[PDB]
mmCIF file of N, CA and C in Angstrom:
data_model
loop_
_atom_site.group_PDB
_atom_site.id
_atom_site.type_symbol
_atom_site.label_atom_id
_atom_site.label_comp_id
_atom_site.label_asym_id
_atom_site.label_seq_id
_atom_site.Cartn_x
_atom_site.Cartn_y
_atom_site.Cartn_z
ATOM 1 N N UNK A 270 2.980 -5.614 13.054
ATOM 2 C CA UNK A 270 2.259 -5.076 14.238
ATOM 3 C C UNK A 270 2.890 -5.605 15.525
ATOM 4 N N UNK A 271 2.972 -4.597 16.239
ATOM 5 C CA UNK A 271 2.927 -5.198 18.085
ATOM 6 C C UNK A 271 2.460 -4.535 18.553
ATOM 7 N N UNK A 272 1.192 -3.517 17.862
ATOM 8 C CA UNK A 272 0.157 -2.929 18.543
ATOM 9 C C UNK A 272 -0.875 -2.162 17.114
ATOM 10 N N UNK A 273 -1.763 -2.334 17.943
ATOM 11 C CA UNK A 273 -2.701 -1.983 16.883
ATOM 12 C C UNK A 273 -3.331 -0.720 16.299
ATOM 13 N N UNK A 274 -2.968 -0.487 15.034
ATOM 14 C CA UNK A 274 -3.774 0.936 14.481
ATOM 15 C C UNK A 274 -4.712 1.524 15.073
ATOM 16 N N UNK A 275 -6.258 0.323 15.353
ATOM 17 C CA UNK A 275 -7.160 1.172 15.615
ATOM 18 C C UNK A 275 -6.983 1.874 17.265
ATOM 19 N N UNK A 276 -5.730 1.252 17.803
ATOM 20 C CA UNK A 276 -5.823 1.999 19.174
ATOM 21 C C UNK A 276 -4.773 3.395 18.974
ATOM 22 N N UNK A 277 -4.118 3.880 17.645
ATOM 23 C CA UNK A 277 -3.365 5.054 17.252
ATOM 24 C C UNK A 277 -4.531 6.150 17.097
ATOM 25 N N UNK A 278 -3.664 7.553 17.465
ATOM 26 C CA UNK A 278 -4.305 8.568 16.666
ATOM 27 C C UNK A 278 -4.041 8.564 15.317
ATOM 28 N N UNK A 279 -4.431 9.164 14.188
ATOM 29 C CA UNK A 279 -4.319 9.072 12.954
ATOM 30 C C UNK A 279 -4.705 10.619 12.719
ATOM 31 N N UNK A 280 -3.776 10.932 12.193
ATOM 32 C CA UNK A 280 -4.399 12.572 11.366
ATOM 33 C C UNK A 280 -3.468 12.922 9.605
ATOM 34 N N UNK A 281 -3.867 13.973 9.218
ATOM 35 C CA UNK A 281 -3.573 13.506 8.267
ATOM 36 C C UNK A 281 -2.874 15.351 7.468
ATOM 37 N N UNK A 282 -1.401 15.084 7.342
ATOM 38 C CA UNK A 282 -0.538 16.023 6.631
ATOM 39 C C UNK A 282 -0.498 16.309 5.489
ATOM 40 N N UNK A 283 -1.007 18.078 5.348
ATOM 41 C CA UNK A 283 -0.864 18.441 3.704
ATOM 42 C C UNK A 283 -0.122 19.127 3.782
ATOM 43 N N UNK A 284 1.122 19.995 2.622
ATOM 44 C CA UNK A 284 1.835 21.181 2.585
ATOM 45 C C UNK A 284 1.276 22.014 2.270
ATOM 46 N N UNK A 285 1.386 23.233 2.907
ATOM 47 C CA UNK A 285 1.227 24.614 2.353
ATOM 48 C C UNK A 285 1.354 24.877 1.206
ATOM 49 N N UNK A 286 0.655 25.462 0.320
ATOM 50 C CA UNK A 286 0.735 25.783 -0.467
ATOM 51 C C UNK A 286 0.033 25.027 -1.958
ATOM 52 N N UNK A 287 0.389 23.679 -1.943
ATOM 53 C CA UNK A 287 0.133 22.867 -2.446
ATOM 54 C C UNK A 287 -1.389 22.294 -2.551
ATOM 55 N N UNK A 288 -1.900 22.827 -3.437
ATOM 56 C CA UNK A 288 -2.981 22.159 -3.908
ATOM 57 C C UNK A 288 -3.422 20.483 -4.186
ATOM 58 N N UNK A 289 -2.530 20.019 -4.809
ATOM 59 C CA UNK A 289 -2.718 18.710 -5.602
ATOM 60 C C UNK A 289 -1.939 17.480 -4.903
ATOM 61 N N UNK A 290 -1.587 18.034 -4.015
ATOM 62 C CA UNK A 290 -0.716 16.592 -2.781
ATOM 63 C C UNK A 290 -1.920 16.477 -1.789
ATOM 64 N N UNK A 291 -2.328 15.486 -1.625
ATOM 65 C CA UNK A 291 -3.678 15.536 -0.876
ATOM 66 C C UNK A 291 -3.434 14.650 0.112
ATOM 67 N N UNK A 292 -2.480 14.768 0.683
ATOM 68 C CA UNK A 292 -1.924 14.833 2.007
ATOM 69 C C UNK A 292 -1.264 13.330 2.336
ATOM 70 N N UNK A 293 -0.412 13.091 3.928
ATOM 71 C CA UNK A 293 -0.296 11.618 3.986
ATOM 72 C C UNK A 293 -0.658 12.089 5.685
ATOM 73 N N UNK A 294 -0.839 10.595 5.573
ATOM 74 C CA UNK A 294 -1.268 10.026 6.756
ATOM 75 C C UNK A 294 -0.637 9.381 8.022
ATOM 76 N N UNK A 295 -0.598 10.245 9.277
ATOM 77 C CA UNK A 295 0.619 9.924 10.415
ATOM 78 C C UNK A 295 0.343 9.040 11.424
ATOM 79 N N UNK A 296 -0.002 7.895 12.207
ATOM 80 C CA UNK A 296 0.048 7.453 13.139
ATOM 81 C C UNK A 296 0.736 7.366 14.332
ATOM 82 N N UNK A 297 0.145 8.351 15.278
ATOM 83 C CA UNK A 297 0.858 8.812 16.415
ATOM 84 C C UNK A 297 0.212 8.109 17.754
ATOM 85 N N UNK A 298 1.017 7.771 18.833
ATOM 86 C CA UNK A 298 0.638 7.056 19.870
ATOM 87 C C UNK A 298 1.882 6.782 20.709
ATOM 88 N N UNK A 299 1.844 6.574 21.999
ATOM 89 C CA UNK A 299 2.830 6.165 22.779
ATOM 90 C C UNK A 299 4.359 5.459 22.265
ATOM 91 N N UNK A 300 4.128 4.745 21.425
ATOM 92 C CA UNK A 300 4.947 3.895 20.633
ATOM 93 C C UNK A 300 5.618 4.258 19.813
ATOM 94 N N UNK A 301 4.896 5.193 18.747
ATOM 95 C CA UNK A 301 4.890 5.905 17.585
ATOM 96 C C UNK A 301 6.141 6.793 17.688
ATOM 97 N N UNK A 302 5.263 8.204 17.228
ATOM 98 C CA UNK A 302 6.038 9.314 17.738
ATOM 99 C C UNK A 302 5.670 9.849 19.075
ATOM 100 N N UNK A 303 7.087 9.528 20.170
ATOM 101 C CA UNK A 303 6.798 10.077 21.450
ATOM 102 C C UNK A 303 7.659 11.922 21.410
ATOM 103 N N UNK A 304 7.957 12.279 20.530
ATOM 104 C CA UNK A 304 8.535 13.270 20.562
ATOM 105 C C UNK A 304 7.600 14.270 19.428
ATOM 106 N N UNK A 305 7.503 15.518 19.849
ATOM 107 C CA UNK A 305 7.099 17.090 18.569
ATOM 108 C C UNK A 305 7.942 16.743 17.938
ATOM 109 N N UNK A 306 9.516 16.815 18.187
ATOM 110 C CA UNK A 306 10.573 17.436 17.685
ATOM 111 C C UNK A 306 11.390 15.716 16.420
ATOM 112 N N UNK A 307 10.755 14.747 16.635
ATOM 113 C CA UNK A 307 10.548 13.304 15.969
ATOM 114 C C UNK A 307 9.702 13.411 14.999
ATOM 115 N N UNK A 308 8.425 13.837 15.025
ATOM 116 C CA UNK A 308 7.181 14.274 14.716
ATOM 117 C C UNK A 308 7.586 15.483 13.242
ATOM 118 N N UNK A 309 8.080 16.032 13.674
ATOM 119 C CA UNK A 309 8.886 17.680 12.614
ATOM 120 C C UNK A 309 9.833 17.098 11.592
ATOM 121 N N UNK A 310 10.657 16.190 12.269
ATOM 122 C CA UNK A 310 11.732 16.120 11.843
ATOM 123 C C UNK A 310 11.505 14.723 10.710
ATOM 124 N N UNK A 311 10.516 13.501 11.307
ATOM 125 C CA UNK A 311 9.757 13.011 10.052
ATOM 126 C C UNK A 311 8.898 13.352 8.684
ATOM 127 N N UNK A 312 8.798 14.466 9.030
ATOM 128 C CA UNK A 312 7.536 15.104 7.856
ATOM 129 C C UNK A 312 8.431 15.866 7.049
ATOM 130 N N UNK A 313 9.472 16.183 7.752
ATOM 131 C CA UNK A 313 10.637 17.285 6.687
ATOM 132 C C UNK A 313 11.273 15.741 5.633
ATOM 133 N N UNK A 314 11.007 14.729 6.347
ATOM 134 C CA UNK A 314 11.806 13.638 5.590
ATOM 135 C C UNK A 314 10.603 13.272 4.166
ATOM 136 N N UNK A 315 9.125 12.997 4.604
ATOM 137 C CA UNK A 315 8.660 12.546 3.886
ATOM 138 C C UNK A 315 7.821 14.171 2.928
ATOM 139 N N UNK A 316 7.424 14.567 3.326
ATOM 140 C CA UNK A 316 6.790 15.783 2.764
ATOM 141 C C UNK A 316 8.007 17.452 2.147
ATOM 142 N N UNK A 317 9.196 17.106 2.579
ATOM 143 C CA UNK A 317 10.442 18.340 2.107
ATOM 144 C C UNK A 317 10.863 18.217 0.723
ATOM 145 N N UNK A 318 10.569 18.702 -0.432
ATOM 146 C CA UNK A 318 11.393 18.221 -1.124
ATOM 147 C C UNK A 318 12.255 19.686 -1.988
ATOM 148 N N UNK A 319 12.665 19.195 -3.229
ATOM 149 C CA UNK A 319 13.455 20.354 -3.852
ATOM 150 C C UNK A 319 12.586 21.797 -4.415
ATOM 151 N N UNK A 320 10.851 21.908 -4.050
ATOM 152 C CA UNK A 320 10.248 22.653 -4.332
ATOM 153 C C UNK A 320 9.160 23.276 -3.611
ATOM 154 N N UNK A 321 8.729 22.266 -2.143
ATOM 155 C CA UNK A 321 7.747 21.689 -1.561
ATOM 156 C C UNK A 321 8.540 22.191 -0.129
ATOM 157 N N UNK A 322 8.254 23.216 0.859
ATOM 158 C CA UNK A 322 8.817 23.255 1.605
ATOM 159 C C UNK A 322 10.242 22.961 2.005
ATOM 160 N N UNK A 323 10.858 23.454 1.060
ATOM 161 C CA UNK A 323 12.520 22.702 0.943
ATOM 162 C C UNK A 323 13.128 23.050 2.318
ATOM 163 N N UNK A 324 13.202 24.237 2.658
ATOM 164 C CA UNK A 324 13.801 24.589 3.581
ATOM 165 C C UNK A 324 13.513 23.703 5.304
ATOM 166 N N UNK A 325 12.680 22.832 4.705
ATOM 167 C CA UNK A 325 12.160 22.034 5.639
ATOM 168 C C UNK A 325 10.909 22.771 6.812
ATOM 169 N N UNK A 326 10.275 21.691 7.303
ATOM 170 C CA UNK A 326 8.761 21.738 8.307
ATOM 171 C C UNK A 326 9.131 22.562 9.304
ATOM 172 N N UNK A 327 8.439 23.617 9.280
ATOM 173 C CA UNK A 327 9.156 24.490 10.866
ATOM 174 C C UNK A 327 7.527 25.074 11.607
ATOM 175 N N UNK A 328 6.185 24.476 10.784
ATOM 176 C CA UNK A 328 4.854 24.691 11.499
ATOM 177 C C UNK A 328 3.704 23.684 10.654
ATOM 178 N N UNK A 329 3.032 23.793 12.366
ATOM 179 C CA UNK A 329 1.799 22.809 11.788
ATOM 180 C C UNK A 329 1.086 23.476 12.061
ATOM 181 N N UNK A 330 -0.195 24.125 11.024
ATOM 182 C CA UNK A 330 -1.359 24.919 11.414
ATOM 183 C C UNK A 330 -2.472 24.088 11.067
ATOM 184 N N UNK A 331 -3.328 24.448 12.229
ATOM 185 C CA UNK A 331 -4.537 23.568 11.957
ATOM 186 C C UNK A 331 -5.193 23.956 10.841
ATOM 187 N N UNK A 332 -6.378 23.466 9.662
ATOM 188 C CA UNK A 332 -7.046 23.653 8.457
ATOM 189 C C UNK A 332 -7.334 24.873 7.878
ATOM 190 N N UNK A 333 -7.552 25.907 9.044
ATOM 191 C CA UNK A 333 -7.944 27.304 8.510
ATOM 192 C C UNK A 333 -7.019 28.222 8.612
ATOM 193 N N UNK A 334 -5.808 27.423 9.127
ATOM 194 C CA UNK A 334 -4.603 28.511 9.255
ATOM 195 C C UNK A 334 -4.615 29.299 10.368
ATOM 196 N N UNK A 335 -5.385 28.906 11.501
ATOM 197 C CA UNK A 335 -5.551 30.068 12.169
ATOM 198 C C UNK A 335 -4.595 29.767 13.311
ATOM 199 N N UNK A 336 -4.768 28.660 13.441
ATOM 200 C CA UNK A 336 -3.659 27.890 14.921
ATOM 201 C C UNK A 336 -2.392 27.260 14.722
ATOM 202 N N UNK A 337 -1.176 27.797 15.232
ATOM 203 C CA UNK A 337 -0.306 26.877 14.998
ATOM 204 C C UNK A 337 -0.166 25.915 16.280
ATOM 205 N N UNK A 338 0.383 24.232 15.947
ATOM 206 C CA UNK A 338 0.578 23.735 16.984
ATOM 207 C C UNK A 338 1.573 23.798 17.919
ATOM 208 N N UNK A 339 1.193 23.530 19.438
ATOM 209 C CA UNK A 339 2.526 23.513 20.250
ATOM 210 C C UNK A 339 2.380 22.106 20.629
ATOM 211 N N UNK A 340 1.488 21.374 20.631
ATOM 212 C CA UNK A 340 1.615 20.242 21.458
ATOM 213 C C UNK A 340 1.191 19.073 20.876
ATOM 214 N N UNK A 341 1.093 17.608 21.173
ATOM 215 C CA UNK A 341 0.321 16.837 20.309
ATOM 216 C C UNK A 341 -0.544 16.070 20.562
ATOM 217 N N UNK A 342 -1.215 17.095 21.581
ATOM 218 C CA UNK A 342 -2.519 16.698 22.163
ATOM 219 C C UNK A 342 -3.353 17.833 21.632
ATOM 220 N N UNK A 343 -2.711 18.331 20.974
ATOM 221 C CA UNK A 343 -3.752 19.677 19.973
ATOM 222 C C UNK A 343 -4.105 18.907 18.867
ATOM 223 N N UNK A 344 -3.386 17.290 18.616
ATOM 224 C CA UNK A 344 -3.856 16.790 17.030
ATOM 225 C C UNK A 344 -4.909 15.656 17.240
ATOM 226 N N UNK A 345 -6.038 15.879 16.455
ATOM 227 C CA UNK A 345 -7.071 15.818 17.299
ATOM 228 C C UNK A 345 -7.098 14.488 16.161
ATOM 229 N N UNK A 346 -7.609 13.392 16.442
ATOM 230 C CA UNK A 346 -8.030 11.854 15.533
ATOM 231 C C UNK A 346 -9.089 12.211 14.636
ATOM 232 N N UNK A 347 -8.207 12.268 12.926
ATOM 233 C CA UNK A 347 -9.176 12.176 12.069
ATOM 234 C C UNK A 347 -8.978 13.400 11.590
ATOM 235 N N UNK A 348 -8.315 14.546 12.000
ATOM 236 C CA UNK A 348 -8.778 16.144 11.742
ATOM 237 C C UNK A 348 -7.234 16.216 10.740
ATOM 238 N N UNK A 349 -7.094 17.314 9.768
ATOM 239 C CA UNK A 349 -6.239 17.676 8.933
ATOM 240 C C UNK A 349 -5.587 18.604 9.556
ATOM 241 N N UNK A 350 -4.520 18.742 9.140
ATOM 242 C CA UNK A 350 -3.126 19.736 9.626
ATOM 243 C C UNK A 350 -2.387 20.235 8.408
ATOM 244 N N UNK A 351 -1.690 21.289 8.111
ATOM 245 C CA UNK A 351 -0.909 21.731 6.910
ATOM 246 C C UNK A 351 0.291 22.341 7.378
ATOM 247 N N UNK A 352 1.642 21.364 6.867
ATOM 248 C CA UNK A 352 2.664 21.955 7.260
ATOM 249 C C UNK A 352 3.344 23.127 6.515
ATOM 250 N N UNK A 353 4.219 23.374 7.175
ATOM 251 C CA UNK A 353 4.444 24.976 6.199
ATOM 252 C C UNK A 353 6.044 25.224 6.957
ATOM 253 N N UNK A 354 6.690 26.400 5.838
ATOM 254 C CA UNK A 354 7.980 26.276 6.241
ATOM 255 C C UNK A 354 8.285 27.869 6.582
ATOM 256 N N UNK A 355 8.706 28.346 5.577
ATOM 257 C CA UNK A 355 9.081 29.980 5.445
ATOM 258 C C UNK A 355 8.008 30.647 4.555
ATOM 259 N N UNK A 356 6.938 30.365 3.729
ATOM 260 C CA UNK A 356 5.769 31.126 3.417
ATOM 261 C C UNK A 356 5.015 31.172 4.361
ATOM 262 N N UNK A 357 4.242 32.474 4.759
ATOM 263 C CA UNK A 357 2.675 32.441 5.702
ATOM 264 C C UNK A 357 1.771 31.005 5.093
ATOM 265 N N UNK A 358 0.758 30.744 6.025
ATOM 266 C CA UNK A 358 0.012 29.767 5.694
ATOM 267 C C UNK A 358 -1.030 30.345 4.355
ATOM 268 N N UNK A 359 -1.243 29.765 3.453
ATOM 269 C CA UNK A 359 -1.772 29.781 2.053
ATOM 270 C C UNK A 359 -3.268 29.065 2.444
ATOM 271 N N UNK A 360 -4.264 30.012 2.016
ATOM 272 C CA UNK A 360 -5.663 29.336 2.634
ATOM 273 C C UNK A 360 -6.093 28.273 0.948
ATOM 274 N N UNK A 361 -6.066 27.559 1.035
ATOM 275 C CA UNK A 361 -6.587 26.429 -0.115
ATOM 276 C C UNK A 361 -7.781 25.866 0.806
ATOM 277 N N UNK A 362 -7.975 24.730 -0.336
ATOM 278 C CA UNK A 362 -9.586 23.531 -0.386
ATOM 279 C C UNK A 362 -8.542 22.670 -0.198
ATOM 280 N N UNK A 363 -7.519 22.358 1.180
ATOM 281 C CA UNK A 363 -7.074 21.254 1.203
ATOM 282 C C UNK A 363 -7.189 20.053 1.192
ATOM 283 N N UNK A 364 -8.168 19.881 2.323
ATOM 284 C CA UNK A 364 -9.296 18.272 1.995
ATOM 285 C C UNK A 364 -10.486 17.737 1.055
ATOM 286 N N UNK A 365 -10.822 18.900 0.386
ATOM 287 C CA UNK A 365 -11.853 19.102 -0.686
ATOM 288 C C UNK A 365 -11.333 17.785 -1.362
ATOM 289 N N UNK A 366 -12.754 16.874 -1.771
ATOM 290 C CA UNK A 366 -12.896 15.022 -2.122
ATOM 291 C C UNK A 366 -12.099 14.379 -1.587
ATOM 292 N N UNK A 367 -10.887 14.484 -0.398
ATOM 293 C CA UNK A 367 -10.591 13.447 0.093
ATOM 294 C C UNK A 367 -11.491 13.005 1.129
ATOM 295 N N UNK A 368 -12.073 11.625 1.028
ATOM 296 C CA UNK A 368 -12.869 10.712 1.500
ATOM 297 C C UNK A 368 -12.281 10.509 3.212
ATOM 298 N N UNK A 369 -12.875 10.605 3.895
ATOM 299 C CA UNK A 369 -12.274 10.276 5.348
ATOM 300 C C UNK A 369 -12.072 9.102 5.985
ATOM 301 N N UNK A 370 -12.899 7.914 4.923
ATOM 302 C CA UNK A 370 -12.187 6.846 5.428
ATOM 303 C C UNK A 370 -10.388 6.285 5.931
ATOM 304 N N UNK A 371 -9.636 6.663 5.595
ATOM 305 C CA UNK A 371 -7.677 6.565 5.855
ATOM 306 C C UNK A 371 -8.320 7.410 7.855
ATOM 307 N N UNK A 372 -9.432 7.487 8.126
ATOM 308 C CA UNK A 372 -9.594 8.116 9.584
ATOM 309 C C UNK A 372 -10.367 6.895 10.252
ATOM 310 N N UNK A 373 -11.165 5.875 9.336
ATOM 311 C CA UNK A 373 -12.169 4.744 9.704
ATOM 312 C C UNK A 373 -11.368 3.533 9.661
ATOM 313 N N UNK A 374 -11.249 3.002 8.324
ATOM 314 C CA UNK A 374 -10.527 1.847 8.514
ATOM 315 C C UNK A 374 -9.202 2.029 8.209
ATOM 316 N N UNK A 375 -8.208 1.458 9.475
ATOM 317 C CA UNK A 375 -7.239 1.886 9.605
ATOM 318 C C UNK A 375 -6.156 0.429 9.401
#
């Protein structure tokens, strides 16, 4: 630490499509990620793989698919996001039993 979690936003990344990855968890803040384009380009690292958005992260839609983001003051502390690449957004039970504490104690 040289600054503290509970003063981060925290939200929390699922892939499109994907049912059974029940998401990870980003800590964003001044410090953090000061860049979208830092922000994109991390999640293609941890969430891209040989089946899973391969082509890499090119949108973040908010839970119902209805919004994509432009900014990252649209990512709101605590709320879910689903990245997505070259398929339309896929409506699933993305957060369905994940517990919201990873939003409490941080």
């Amino acid at each position: 630490t040289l600054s503290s979690e509970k003063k981060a936003k925290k939200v929390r990344f699922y892939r499109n499509g994907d049912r059974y990855f029940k998401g990870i968890v980003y800590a964003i803040s001044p410090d953090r990620f000061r860049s979208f384009e830092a922000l994109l380009a991390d999640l293609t690292r941890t969430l891209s793989d040989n089946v899973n958005l391969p082509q890499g992260v090119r949108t973040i839609y908010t839970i119902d698919g209805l919004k994509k983001i432009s900014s990252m003051d649209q990512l709101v502390e605590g709320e879910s996001y689903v990245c997505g690449s070259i398929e339309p957004f896929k409506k699933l039970e993305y957060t369905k039993n994940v517990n919201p504490n990873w939003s409490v104690n941080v």
